Design a protein around this ligand. Structure first.
Ligand code: Q2F
Length: 127
C-alpha cells in the first residue's frame, strides 16, 4: 500500500507564535523524550509499508510522531501549548488504538507518556 503524506510542519496561512511555554516544550519536554532509549519508533511517521503494519492508515486517520512535533515547534507552528500537548497525546493515543494492550510498543509509549506527564507538570506560567 502507499503511505499518506506526512503532517504539515509549517503553513504560510496559519499564524505562528513563540511563547516561553512552547520554548519549554521544545527545549525540555521534547528533548527529554527524544533521547529516551524507547523513543526511536516515535521519531518519524509510520512507514506502514516498511514496518509491515497492516491497515495502519485504515485505522489511524490522525497520525502524529515526535519528528513532526519537533519540526512544528522549531517552525513556530503552534499558537499555544495546548496545541502541542494535543499532538503528543494524539501520538500516544494512536499507539494505544492500533496496537494490542501489553505489546512492547504500548509499554514503550506508556513509559514515554509517564515521563511526558512529569515534564508537563512543571510547565512554566506564560511570560
Ligand atoms: C509508534 C509507531 N510505530 C513504529 N513502529 C511500530 C509502531 C507501532 O504503532 N506499532 C508497531 O508494532 N511498531 C513496530 C514495533 C517493532 C518493535 C519495536 C520494539 N523493539 S525493541 O526496541 O528491540 C524493544 C524495546 C523494549 C522492549 O522491552 C521493554 C520491556 C519493558 O518495557 C518496555 C518494553 C523490547 F522487548 C524490545 C517497537 C516498534
Amino acid at each position: 500500500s502507499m503511505n499518506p503524506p506526512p503532517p504539515e510542519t509549517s503553513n504560510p496561512n496559519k499564524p505562528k507564535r513563540q511563547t516561553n511555554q512552547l520554548q519549554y516544550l521544545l527545549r525540555v519536554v521534547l528533548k527529554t523524550l527524544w533521547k529516551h532509549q524507547f523513543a526511536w519508533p516515535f521519531q518519524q511517521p509510520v512507514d506502514a509499508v516498511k514496518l509491515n503494519l497492516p491497515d495502519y492508515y485504515k485505522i489511524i486517520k490522525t497520525p502524529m510522531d515526535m519528528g513532526t512535533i519537533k519540526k512544528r515547534l522549531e517552525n513556530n507552528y503552534y499558537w499555544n501549548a495546548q496545541e502541542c500537548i494535543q499532538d503528543f497525546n494524539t501520538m500516544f493515543t494512536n499507539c494505544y488504538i492500533y496496537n494490542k494492550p501489553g505489546d512492547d510498543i504500548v509499554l514503550m509509549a506508556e513509559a514515554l507518556e509517564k515521563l511526558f506527564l512529569q515534564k508537563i507538570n512543571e510547565l512554566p506560567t506564560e511570560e
